[PDB]
Amino acid sequence: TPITGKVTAVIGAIVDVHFEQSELPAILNALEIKTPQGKLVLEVAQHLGENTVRTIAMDGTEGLVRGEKVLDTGGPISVPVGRETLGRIINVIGEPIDERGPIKSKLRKPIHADPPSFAEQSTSAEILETGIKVVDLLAPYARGGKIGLFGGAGVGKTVFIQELINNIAKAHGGFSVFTGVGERTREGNDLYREMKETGVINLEGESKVALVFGQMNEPPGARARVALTGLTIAEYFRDEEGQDVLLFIDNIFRFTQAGSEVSALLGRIPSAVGYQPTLATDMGLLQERITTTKKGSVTSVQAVYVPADDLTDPAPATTFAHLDATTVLSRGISELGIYPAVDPLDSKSRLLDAAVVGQEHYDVASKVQETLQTYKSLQDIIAILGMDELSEQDKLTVERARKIQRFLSQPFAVAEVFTGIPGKLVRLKDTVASFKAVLEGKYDNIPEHAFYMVGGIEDVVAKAEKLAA
Amino acid sequence: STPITGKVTAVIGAIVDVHFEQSELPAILNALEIKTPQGKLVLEVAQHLGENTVRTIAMDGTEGLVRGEKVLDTGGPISVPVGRETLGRIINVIGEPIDERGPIKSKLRKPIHADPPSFAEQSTSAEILETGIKVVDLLAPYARGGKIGLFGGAGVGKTVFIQELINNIAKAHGGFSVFTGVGERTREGNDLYREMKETGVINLEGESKVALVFGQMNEPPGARARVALTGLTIAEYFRDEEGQDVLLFIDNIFRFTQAGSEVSALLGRIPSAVGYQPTLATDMGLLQERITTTKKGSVTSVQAVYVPADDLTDPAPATTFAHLDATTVLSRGISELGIYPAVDPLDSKSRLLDAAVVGQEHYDVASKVQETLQTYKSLQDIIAILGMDELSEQDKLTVERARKIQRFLSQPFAVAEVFTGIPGKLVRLKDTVASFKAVLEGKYDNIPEHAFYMVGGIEDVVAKAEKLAA
Amino acid sequence: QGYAAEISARRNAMDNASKNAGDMINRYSILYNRTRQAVITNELVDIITGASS
Amino acid sequence: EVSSILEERIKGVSDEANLNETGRVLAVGDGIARVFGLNNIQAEELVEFSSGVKGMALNLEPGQVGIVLFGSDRLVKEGELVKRTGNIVDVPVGPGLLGRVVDALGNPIDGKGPIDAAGRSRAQVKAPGILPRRSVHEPVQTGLKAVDALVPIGRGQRELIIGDRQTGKTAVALDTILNQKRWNNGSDESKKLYCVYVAVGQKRSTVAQLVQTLEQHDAMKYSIIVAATASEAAPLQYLAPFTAASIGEWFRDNGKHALIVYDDLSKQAVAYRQLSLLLRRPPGREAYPGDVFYLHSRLLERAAKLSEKEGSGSLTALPVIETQGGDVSAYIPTNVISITDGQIFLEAELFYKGIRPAINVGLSVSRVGSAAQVKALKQVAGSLKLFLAQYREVAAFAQFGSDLDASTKQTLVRGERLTQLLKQNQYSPLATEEQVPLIYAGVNGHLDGIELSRIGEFESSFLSYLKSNHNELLTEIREKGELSKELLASLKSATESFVAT
């Protein structure tokens, strides 16, 4: 628009501008303030009345002189999408961070999207395997699924996610997006390295991945819109090409978190627990722009960082409504020498049923939950007394439950070095057989260290010999 | 002060601000009436904000309000009707019936802001109520002139309890009762209306022995609040001018509390600890203080209270614990075991438990009952952990006397011919003291536990023995 | 013989319990104190939110 | 084709009349705005923004009137004029909402064409009187043997389903709706339910699975699905219970019964929090509004049974409150408990224990007692309540390793069998005729001769036994709905002939 103005204020990353022309502005516009940083791109989020707009600031706020000229772009920022975004890493505004220079496109689209309707909905009930024993039996995923992960980071989240990439994107091979919201820069480089080595990113060709990286160094505003940027790319894939995609995020708590910082400033009074009053509306849009449509479907794996490792907080809690399946991970179990650290009693899926992933799957999975739970209820008793001061029927359950517990592990193929055990991969079909077996009492009569750091039933047997000698 | 015309300036839900013309405003606590396409909207004036701007609490449903819509001033407070002819009749916040009896038959009208009676007028309570409910009579005696309190949590049979007391005592006495419902459901109101017309207590020919004030939760938080005030004023007319003792009831009194908390926040006031009003103390006091024994007549409330999650570290129930003379707890557990009433009598304390009020004999029997039961409750952990160890013949005999007593607390009720189908029994004060005395002495330690199940007096235990024999 | 060794087992076990239970008491006490304190902080946040509006 | 649709629309558009109000937008963004002016504005009335947005108006001030936008805020600009529609918010009600999804405002989002309108109604109607109400006697079941058996489910009552998020909170409701097939088919409409399911704060994909479930089991033909997904505006999530209640109320007026599911009120509350703080007016406890109680209580007292000078209808309510990492003493949870007349508490731990559908019988209460269980079903569950309440004390003592007498272990042995009988498979309808036989067996001590693992094997087989031989016993129960002398004997003999397996 030829609307010009000057900068009244510059309070943190939430600059306010005041338009000297009576031509009136619109919500979700963008303004460029000419900076010695080249230029700074900002986004109107509020109009406060009297032509004093309030704008979110993506990049730095060192250099912004007060009463400095603007020109109003007149609309939302459009990123660049295509198949010429594959093998490039793009910043929020579009810029290469891997420096293969300007990003090519056929279509450049607004960041924001309008979430699909009830009419555009389609359904799924497919079976997707990671190949992880605990995930498959107790919480099976599907094709187009939305998955949720929880508990803190710097404890194996990165590795866990890296491993999910290592399985699902090579059992698919089509288009994929990695979008990293408030990514830890030293790790981000390990993904870049890891991918090129494992043949994913290929830059003497075109990759089977496209990428978005936003670091946690960056002002709150940029961190909020890393995610929306990423989604524009995934929608391109979903819609224009007509093909199903992947999405991985480590962590999406950051979307929430960054929005919480900017809220206080914007005019908004923040709710109790210091979380923005707008969590609901932002969540609602994101989780419905990753959704199973008539065209494609974006099967997504989401990592939430939880503060104090409490779900009682409203930010993690409001997310559960929009997730078909969860696999809650708790730091303590990671400490115990068990990987994956996913809790087996604090896991759920809406696709674990007696005809969805079959009846055998359900009976095995049911039994493990019943066995472990009873054991959980008796943990007080077992420690204050002994383990023959228990009633007899229970003695069988307790002993059975202990074997399952050591069994749950499955060394990772991406952290094979760090565990100090080779990476193990086993089928959903191999896993159903292996859990079945333990429950039958077939190889129940052998040490608890035998089931300790090993994948399926087969590995257990091989190790009894190792201890025996 | 006097009738004037003001125009609405701001509608913020229940909260309504008016901007009356210069030098002309109503005084605090008045009633403004505003023409609305839904009855007559009554606004209660609660502040002055300067330049002749008042801020009000709604008494009738808000919807379709224009800023600029004329507001008259009555010149005085919300004025209800009172009388010995409003007995059976139903009255709400604006004194209209909701079972469509049209305009109330009024002898007199009165304000709901009645300042409390003073210390000169006081008299010392010596008249003794009987409820005819054994567990209540023996372990927390009520006295007529009292301020009884039916503490309990959620869904614990409070309504069923109130229903038995009103069915029995109101007819018995030559006094009045006014039954007041603060913010309670239209399922309950319709049950409370139906059951008490049937029994002959409320009757359309003749003068009803218990009046009704139904204030219900579909109405505003403001409108719900001053329902309690409405009932009280009827009891006050009875106390004073008619010169008759009252046997008051209010139901549930946490609804009263909750409403004031809500409106504290809307008026802009700063909330206190655990989301409670800063004005919590004084509001309970105002109502409780009006309900008192004067040389005019008594007023005796029996008040249901909702106690979130059987929790009393929560400040709103704990403050209320002070005001109420002869507490009882309706524990959730007692009801489920099949024991009616739901009263747990080792958590009920009364201040009306002396030893020359109720005689020495009453106090002493109940004391033994308290100990006998509590030693048995103490031994439960002991069997739980140790097994059959660390016991004695003395313990065995106490365990046995207590289980005979434990199943000797159940008294069927007529107003639970709808819950279990077991019809009522009435047990005199002197009669309960005797029958409990007999068991303690161990003359009825030869009659099985289930032969004290759903009995009254002593005759009843002997008769329930024959049934089990036969 | 059996009967003395039985009272002895009973003796070893109820003595051990008092120690294990001690360790659990200490652990819920740190948890108790902290959970009481966490609640006071949370009540202060609520007041702030009110006052701002 | 496409040329014709667009040309009709141009004909269908434009040409506005002389306006009688104005006001100029200033503050604006978040789905929320504030205008300067407006002296004819009513509270709750609809104001038409010249961008294509409509926003209802909830706060008026002699400064700046707060009209909360519905529409996308990106369309809205400042300095625009707004025009009062001049009507408070209303929805068309009619029998053309049968087997179709409609949103917040009452237009179809499932693309099944225009609805059939026989009236309009308003979202606020409020509770009927004491005289036009009668008491609830009206049997109804949920297709969960446990729930029916332990707590008295009625038609015209309000029962609050409470417990942790995503424990098949929705799934519990879906079993009831499936089981509401049985009465709908029956000829009489004085039985029929036209169930209305309200879904607030849920993703579009959750709703889309649920409609497939309903049609597959041939239960979508009386059901209505009202929606307000989590992206869609803070007013529209607030308006979703109130307009569901007006749809429900039309059946009531006609003298037909229906049932309203409010899943979740907890997320309605969260919306209203966002709304109240962006009209910058004080909230109550924990940032949730001060007038949040007014919302749940008014709504809830409208699902009411009617007397015989009226339709003799009754809308039934089931609230659902998901407690975020538990907490029953949290402000929205506490308020609703007080308003409801019963609780059907769902406990999370028991789910892993294998007691699905999960319930905990102490946390579930009935204040006024049984009065809406089928009379047959009352007779059999007579001591079921006393057993299970006792089992809980005895079991806790029993597993310690201590010594027990035979008397205490009759409770343990008896309870274990009873609990195992309760277990049922989700998405499986059930009938009175097939819950009366099973409770008899359990109470009258014929499930102790049968081993604990094969109690489940037994159930399916016992009912089959009856189809071939004692098919007369089942028919008497369906037809008379009570057990007399003869029926007790007949059944006592029916249990005996097949106790094996």
From Swiss-Prot, chain B:
ATP binds at G152, G153, A154, G155, V156, G157, K158, T159. It is an enzyme of class 7 (translocase). The modification Phosphoserine is found at S335. Keywords: ATP synthesis, ATP-binding, CF(1), Hydrogen ion transport, Ion transport, Membrane, Mitochondrion, Mitochondrion inner membrane, Nucleotide-binding, Phosphoprotein, Transit peptide, Translocase, Transport. SUPFAM superfamilies: C-terminal domain of alpha and beta subunits of F1 ATP synthase, N-terminal domain of alpha and beta subunits of F1 ATP synthase, P-loop containing nucleoside triphosphate hydrolases. The modification Phosphothreonine is found at T74, T199. GO terms for molecular function: ATP binding; ATP hydrolysis activity; proton-transporting ATP synthase activity, rotational mechanism; proton-transporting ATPase activity, rotational mechanism. NCBIfam families: atpD (TIGR01039). F-type ATPases have 2 components, CF(1) - the catalytic core - and CF(0) - the membrane proton channel. CF(1) has five subunits: alpha(3), beta(3), gamma(1), delta(1), epsilon(1). CF(0) has three main subunits: a, b and c. This is ATP synthase subunit beta, mitochondrial. It comes from Saccharomyces cerevisiae (strain ATCC 204508 / S288c). The lineage of its organism: Eukaryota, Fungi, Dikarya, Ascomycota, Saccharomycotina.
Swiss-Prot record, chain C:
Changing I47T: In ATP3-1; dominant suppressor of the slow-growth phenotype of yme1 strains lacking mitochondrial DNA. It is found in: Mitochondrion; Mitochondrion inner membrane. It comes from the Eukaryota. Changing A17V: Lower activity. F-type ATPases have 2 components, CF(1) - the catalytic core - and CF(0) - the membrane proton channel. CF(1) has five subunits: alpha(3), beta(3), gamma(1), delta(1), epsilon(1). CF(0) has three main subunits: a, b and c. Belongs to the ATPase gamma chain family. Mitochondrial membrane ATP synthase (F(1)F(0) ATP synthase or Complex V) produces ATP from ADP in the presence of a proton gradient across the membrane which is generated by electron transport complexes of the respiratory chain. F-type ATPases consist of two structural domains, F(1) - containing the extramembraneous catalytic core, and F(0) - containing the membrane proton channel, linked together by a central stalk and a peripheral stalk. During catalysis, ATP synthesis in the catalytic domain of F(1) is coupled via a rotary mechanism of the central stalk subunits to proton translocation. Present with 28100 molecules/cell in log phase SD medium. This is ATP synthase subunit gamma, mitochondrial.
Curated annotation (Swiss-Prot), chain D:
The keyword Transport applies. The keyword Nucleotide-binding applies. InterPro entries: ATP_synth_asu-like_sf, ATP_synth_asu_C, ATP_synth_asu_C_sf, ATP_synth_F1_a_nt-bd_dom, ATP_synth_F1_asu, ATPase_a/bsu_AS, ATPase_F1/V1/A1_a/bsu_N, ATPase_F1/V1/A1_a/bsu_N_sf. Gene3D superfamilies: 2.40.30.20, ATP synthase alpha/beta chain, C-terminal domain, P-loop containing nucleotide triphosphate hydrolases. One of its GO terms (molecular function) is ATP binding. ATP binds at G163, D164, R165, Q166, T167, G168, K169, T170. It holds the Pfam family ATP-synt_ab. Its main location: mitochondrion. Keywords: ATP synthesis, ATP-binding, CF(1), Hydrogen ion transport, Ion transport, Membrane, Mitochondrion, Mitochondrion inner membrane, Nucleotide-binding, Phosphoprotein, Transit peptide, Transport. GO terms for cellular component: cytosol; mitochondrial inner membrane; mitochondrial intermembrane space; mitochondrial nucleoid; mitochondrion; proton-transporting ATP synthase complex. CDD domains: ATP-synt_F1_alpha_C, ATP-synt_F1_alpha_N, F1-ATPase_alpha_CD. The record marks S364 as: Required for activity. It is found in: Mitochondrion inner membrane. PANTHER family: ATP SYNTHASE SUBUNIT ALPHA, MITOCHONDRIAL (PTHR48082:SF2). Mitochondrial membrane ATP synthase (F(1)F(0) ATP synthase or Complex V) produces ATP from ADP in the presence of a proton gradient across the membrane which is generated by electron transport complexes of the respiratory chain. F-type ATPases consist of two structural domains, F(1) - containing the extramembraneous catalytic core, and F(0) - containing the membrane proton channel, linked together by a central stalk and a peripheral stalk. During catalysis, ATP synthesis in the catalytic domain of F(1) is coupled via a rotary mechanism of the central stalk subunits to proton translocation. This is ATP synthase subunit alpha, mitochondrial. It comes from Saccharomyces cerevisiae (strain ATCC 204508 / S288c) (Baker's yeast). The gene is ATP1.
